[PDB]
Design a protein around this motif. Structure first.
Motif, PDB file in Angstrom:
ATOM      1  N   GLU A   1       0.217  -1.095  -0.029  1.00 22.54           N
ATOM      2  CA  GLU A   1       0.124  -0.025   0.031  1.00 22.54           C
ATOM      3  C   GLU A   1       0.751   0.966  -0.231  1.00 22.54           C
ATOM      4  O   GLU A   1       2.007   1.019  -0.207  1.00 22.54           O
ATOM      5  CB  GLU A   1      -0.974  -0.102   1.211  1.00 22.54           C
ATOM      6  N   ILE A   2       0.065   2.643   0.595  1.00 22.79           N
ATOM      7  CA  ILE A   2       1.108   3.708   0.207  1.00 22.79           C
ATOM      8  C   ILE A   2       1.813   3.581  -0.966  1.00 22.79           C
ATOM      9  O   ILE A   2       1.667   2.660  -2.106  1.00 22.79           O
ATOM     10  CB  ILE A   2       2.315   3.339   1.509  1.00 22.79           C
ATOM     11  N   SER A   3       2.364   5.013  -1.231  1.00 19.87           N
ATOM     12  CA  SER A   3       2.771   5.263  -2.613  1.00 19.87           C
ATOM     13  C   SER A   3       3.726   6.384  -2.181  1.00 19.87           C
ATOM     14  O   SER A   3       3.206   7.150  -1.945  1.00 19.87           O
ATOM     15  CB  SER A   3       1.791   5.466  -3.278  1.00 19.87           C
ATOM     16  N   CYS A   4       4.887   7.224  -3.083  1.00 25.00           N
ATOM     17  CA  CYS A   4       5.400   8.042  -3.274  1.00 25.00           C
ATOM     18  C   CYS A   4       6.840   8.382  -3.442  1.00 25.00           C
ATOM     19  O   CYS A   4       7.356   6.624  -3.819  1.00 25.00           O
ATOM     20  CB  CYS A   4       5.970   8.500  -1.553  1.00 25.00           C
ATOM     21  N   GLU A   5       7.690   8.903  -3.766  1.00 27.76           N
ATOM     22  CA  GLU A   5       9.226   9.124  -4.406  1.00 27.76           C
ATOM     23  C   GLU A   5      10.377   7.995  -3.144  1.00 27.76           C
ATOM     24  O   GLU A   5      10.074   8.974  -2.005  1.00 27.76           O
ATOM     25  CB  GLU A   5       9.489  10.512  -3.891  1.00 27.76           C
TER      26      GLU A   5
ATOM     27  N   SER B   1       5.555   2.694   0.169  1.00 24.84           N
ATOM     28  CA  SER B   1       6.038   3.258   2.077  1.00 24.84           C
ATOM     29  C   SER B   1       6.927   3.938   2.736  1.00 24.84           C
ATOM     30  O   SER B   1       7.201   4.875   1.887  1.00 24.84           O
ATOM     31  CB  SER B   1       6.121   1.574   2.478  1.00 24.84           C
ATOM     32  N   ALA B   2       7.209   4.265   3.943  1.00 30.79           N
ATOM     33  CA  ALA B   2       7.971   5.159   4.113  1.00 30.79           C
ATOM     34  C   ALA B   2       8.324   5.027   5.901  1.00 30.79           C
ATOM     35  O   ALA B   2       7.454   4.916   6.618  1.00 30.79           O
ATOM     36  CB  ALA B   2       7.096   6.652   4.004  1.00 30.79           C
ATOM     37  N   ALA B   3       9.202   5.039   6.201  1.00 33.54           N
ATOM     38  CA  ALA B   3       9.320   4.569   7.781  1.00 33.54           C
ATOM     39  C   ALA B   3       9.346   6.143   8.311  1.00 33.54           C
ATOM     40  O   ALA B   3       9.285   7.445   7.865  1.00 33.54           O
ATOM     41  CB  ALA B   3      11.114   4.159   7.365  1.00 33.54           C
ATOM     42  N   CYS B   4       8.874   5.989   9.001  1.00 29.59           N
ATOM     43  CA  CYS B   4       7.973   7.414   9.802  1.00 29.59           C
ATOM     44  C   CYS B   4       8.387   7.017  11.060  1.00 29.59           C
ATOM     45  O   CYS B   4       9.198   6.124  12.243  1.00 29.59           O
ATOM     46  CB  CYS B   4       6.835   7.356   9.950  1.00 29.59           C
TER      47      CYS B   4
ATOM     48  N   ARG C   1       9.629   8.846   5.995  1.00 28.48           N
ATOM     49  CA  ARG C   1      10.700   8.896   4.930  1.00 28.48           C
ATOM     50  C   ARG C   1       9.403   7.700   4.402  1.00 28.48           C
ATOM     51  O   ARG C   1      10.079   6.441   4.429  1.00 28.48           O
ATOM     52  CB  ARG C   1      11.901   8.457   6.068  1.00 28.48           C
ATOM     53  N   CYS C   2       9.503   8.682   2.495  1.00 28.88           N
ATOM     54  CA  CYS C   2       9.723   6.824   1.768  1.00 28.88           C
ATOM     55  C   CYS C   2      10.395   6.261   1.445  1.00 28.88           C
ATOM     56  O   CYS C   2      11.555   6.893   1.038  1.00 28.88           O
ATOM     57  CB  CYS C   2       9.311   7.733   0.485  1.00 28.88           C
ATOM     58  N   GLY C   3      10.242   4.953   1.764  1.00 28.31           N
ATOM     59  CA  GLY C   3      10.934   4.179   1.813  1.00 28.31           C
ATOM     60  C   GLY C   3      11.503   4.003   0.473  1.00 28.31           C
ATOM     61  O   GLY C   3      11.273   4.063  -0.667  1.00 28.31           O
TER      62      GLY C   3
END
Length: 36
Positions: free
Chosen positions: A1-5, A25-28, A18-20
């Motif tokens: 799920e999720i999405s980003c640079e 995904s992304a560690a937050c 932090r977009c992985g």
């Protein structure tokens, strides 16, 4: 799920993520949720 640079960081939730390396995904991190 999720999405980003992948490799980039952003806010996403009310704290800071932090977009992985993957664009899904992304560690937050957690802390008060700024809104004002």
């Amino acid at each position: 799920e999720i999405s980003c640079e992948p490799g980039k960081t952003f806010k996403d939730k009310c704290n800071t993520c932090r977009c992985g390396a993957d664009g899904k995904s992304a560690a937050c991190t957690l802390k008060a949720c700024p809104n004002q």
